[PDB]
Amino acid sequence: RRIRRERNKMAAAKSRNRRRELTDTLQAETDQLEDEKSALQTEIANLLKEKEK
Amino acid sequence: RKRMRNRIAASKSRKRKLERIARLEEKVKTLKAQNSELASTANMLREQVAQL
Amino acid sequence: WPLSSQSGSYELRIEVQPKPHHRAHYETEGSRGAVKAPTGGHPVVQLHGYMENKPLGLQIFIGTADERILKPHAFYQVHRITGKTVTTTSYEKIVGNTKVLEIPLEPKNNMRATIDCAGILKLRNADIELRKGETDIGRKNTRVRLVFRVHIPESSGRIVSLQTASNPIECSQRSAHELPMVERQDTDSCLVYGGQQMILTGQNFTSESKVVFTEKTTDGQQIWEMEATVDKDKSQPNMLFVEIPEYRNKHIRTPVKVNFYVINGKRKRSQPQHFTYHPV
DNA sequence: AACTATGAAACAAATTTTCC
DNA sequence: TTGGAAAATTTGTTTCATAG
């Protein structure tokens, strides 16, 4: 039936978008952690410059 | 058999989405850990410099 | 090196930016040559305040681009372009999973350097993603940045290190033809009202070209999307006259950071550009 | 019985890599 | 060397079959 089919379309769209948003979210997380990581590291190299006076 | 070659391609393409989500999780764990240690180092050095 | 470094106290500076596109070659091909500059020339780099008389060494490696923390690209590598009839710059070729080019910085040459020994090799995606540790995909990750470094030895026994990145270079044949790209913005900001016209200068600006403004939280969760009416009638196939859209919340007290992009079709969108609205 | 979520099939659209 | 594009590979989409 034309309807039972446009519905399975959705269920598969939904199922696909869901799994994609997940990677798009794990990927957003790592990319913000990598940002905080470089900020800490730059911060450390600055404090170390000061420690050398 | 082309129909068979595409079957594997899709089989691999799906398996690939899995490994990727997994690699990103193991990655998120480690980053939170390294950032923790780094946050400490930043604090140790922070105190020291203040007392020089 | 993935560790951060910045324009040192000497200020390492990119003098002549390379060209916006440079189709890289595969190991299944022959060198497509060295990166060039929009003048027909070659990119030029220089250490500014080095009052000494000892020849330094400029390191070169291919780094990422896009909206990321700079790092060595995993899909691209510098290629020691063997030179032409008159090879201006000499090279040293080292590794560490990523090729690094060493070229002299002569005090004679005003501590300046012309890059013409640097080309770009592209590795096969399926080979890179194969290795454990990699979370990046090659699929469409085709932009790059030429990254240069110096390790300035001091009187104190110290080593002041500097680093600079060229503007992003599009290393894909197709994407060079398909994806729009901004190289210049009229303004980087304005107040909540918008309306002012922003002049974009880039590559591949057709008429399917639409510009969208977006808002994002620290989670990447988008909360605002607004299509800016960009003027289209007569201009240049690489220049857009956008009318900055009014910000959603016109009552802010702190400036807000938004993004915008030039887009064609659906899978042809430029990397996110930066904009910021200021409260009144 | 009926209906959503999901993996797998087929074939098409998108993007990369080999060839000329 | 360049530029172009056929050939090869991936990834997206619409269906089916089907567990729950």
Side-chain angles (χ1 to χ4, degrees), chain C residues 203-223:
Chain C
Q203 292 293 319
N204 300 3
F205 295 164
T206 84
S207 289
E208 309 287 67
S209 294
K210 292 304 174 184
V211 183
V212 190
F213 278 79
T214 65
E215 248 286 66
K216 254 183 186 53
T217 55
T218 24
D219 326 73
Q221 285 282 311
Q222 100 85 235
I223 60 270

Side-chain angles (χ1 to χ4, degrees), chain A:
Chain A
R1 182 202 285 90
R2 58 155 53 54
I3 296 215
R4 146 180 155 148
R5 274 189 198 139
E6 48 209 39
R7 286 195 179 184
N8 198 230
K9 257 183 174 176
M10 293 196 115
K14 166 162 184 169
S15 201
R16 257 151 47 237
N17 297 13
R18 157 192 165 272
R19 171 165 40 240
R20 192 248 313 147
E21 178 185 58
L22 165 56
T23 78
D24 282 24
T25 295
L26 298 190
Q27 185 60 78
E29 200 175 339
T30 79
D31 281 12
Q32 73 142 197
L33 291 202
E34 305 253 57
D35 272 48
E36 291 149 26
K37 191 188 157 155
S38 234
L40 282 183
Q41 296 196 268
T42 50
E43 191 200 306
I44 287 181
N46 273 229
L47 293 173
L48 285 183
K49 197 175 182 180
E50 212 87 44
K51 233 189 60 171
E52 288 299 75
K53 281 292 183 303

Side-chain angles (χ1 to χ4, degrees), chain C residues 26 29 122 124-125 139-140 174:
Chain C
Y26 289 67
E29 305 187 296
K122 167 82 158 55
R124 307 187 187 110
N125 293 155
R139 193 144 234 264
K140 303 192 63 60
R174 188 189 159 201

Side-chain angles (χ1 to χ4, degrees), chain B residues 8-49:
Chain B
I8 306 183
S11 157
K12 169 185 297 173
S13 203
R14 262 128 50 172
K15 174 181 171 187
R16 277 230 239 130
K17 277 197 178 188
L18 254 49
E19 183 91 25
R20 157 158 225 219
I21 279 177
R23 289 189 173 180
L24 282 170
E25 282 162 3
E26 304 158 276
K27 162 155 295 194
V28 160
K29 280 197 183 63
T30 7
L31 289 176
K32 274 161 164 182
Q34 292 183 317
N35 279 25
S36 150
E37 289 208 64
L38 297 174
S40 283
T41 304
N43 273 305
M44 163 84 271
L45 307 182
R46 207 191 303 283
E47 282 172 7
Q48 300 187 6
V49 166

Side-chain angles (χ1 to χ4, degrees), chain C residues 1-79 83-84 88-230 237-280:
Chain C
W1 218 343
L3 303 197
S4 359
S5 263
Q6 181 180 359
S7 320
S9 192
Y10 299 92
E11 159 133 48
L12 182 46
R13 187 128 77 169
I14 307 269
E15 228 61 59
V16 167
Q17 281 301 341
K19 229 213 307 293
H21 298 99
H22 170 92
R23 176 183 167 179
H25 59 274
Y26 289 67
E27 307 154 276
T28 307
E29 305 187 296
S31 169
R32 311 201 145 233
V35 189
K36 312 136 188 87
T39 63
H42 283 237
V44 159
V45 152
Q46 186 178 37
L47 207 196
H48 285 142
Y50 180 65
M51 315 314 212
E52 286 295 289
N53 234 257
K54 318 292 166 183
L56 253 299
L58 195 64
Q59 274 181 310
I60 313 168
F61 62 94
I62 295 298
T64 60
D66 285 8
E67 283 275 275
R68 339 196 65 220
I69 289 299
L70 194 295
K71 67 165 176 182
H73 221 286
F75 309 105
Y76 295 96
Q77 296 286 267
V78 251
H79 181 259
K84 297 74 176 179
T88 307
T89 315
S90 291
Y91 82 123
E92 183 199 287
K93 185 176 150 292
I94 1 170
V95 296
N97 207 231
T98 58
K99 250 173 303 164
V100 193
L101 251 211
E102 186 71 282
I103 70 150
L105 256 194
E106 312 291 31
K108 311 129 192 184
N109 281 103
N110 205 144
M111 279 315 233
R112 233 160 178 258
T114 293
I115 325 297
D116 62 345
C117 34
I120 314 181
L121 161 70
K122 167 82 158 55
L123 308 162
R124 307 187 187 110
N125 293 155
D127 283 312
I128 304 306
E129 292 162 347
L130 196 306
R131 62 187 181 212
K132 192 86 145 164
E134 262 308 317
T135 61
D136 273 338
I137 46 183
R139 193 144 234 264
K140 303 192 63 60
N141 170 42
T142 52
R143 281 124 322 218
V144 147
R145 263 184 293 161
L146 292 161
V147 184
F148 314 105
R149 270 189 176 176
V150 268
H151 295 327
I152 302 178
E154 282 200 323
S155 27
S156 51
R158 280 283 138 230
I159 286 290
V160 158
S161 289
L162 312 69
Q163 173 172 281
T164 57
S166 64
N167 293 332
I169 312 310
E170 170 65 72
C171 295
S172 154
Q173 187 198 337
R174 188 189 159 201
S175 300
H177 177 51
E178 311 289 35
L179 313 182
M181 159 166 194
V182 192
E183 310 168 299
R184 264 179 177 61
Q185 272 172 243
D186 193 79
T187 32
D188 284 38
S189 175
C190 88
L191 41 76
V192 299
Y193 285 122
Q196 188 186 280
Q197 171 226 248
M198 188 190 31
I199 283 180
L200 257 24
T201 306
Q203 292 293 319
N204 300 3
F205 295 164
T206 84
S207 289
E208 309 287 67
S209 294
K210 292 304 174 184
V211 183
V212 190
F213 278 79
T214 65
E215 248 286 66
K216 254 183 186 53
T217 55
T218 24
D219 326 73
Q221 285 282 311
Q222 100 85 235
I223 60 270
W224 185 56
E225 186 125 353
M226 177 67 190
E227 157 97 62
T229 54
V230 50
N238 64 175
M239 182 166 276
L240 291 163
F241 298 80
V242 200
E243 179 197 45
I244 308 156
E246 186 198 312
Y247 187 69
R248 55 197 195 92
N249 176 16
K250 47 212 295 69
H251 294 143
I252 44 165
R253 300 279 66 198
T254 310
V256 200
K257 292 178 182 182
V258 301
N259 291 121
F260 68 82
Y261 48 75
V262 191
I263 165 157
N264 302 329
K266 174 181 169 184
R267 277 144 189 280
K268 296 171 191 178
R269 49 168 57 197
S270 67
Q271 294 301 120
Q273 248 44 45
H274 299 309
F275 194 76
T276 162
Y277 289 94
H278 280 115
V280 48

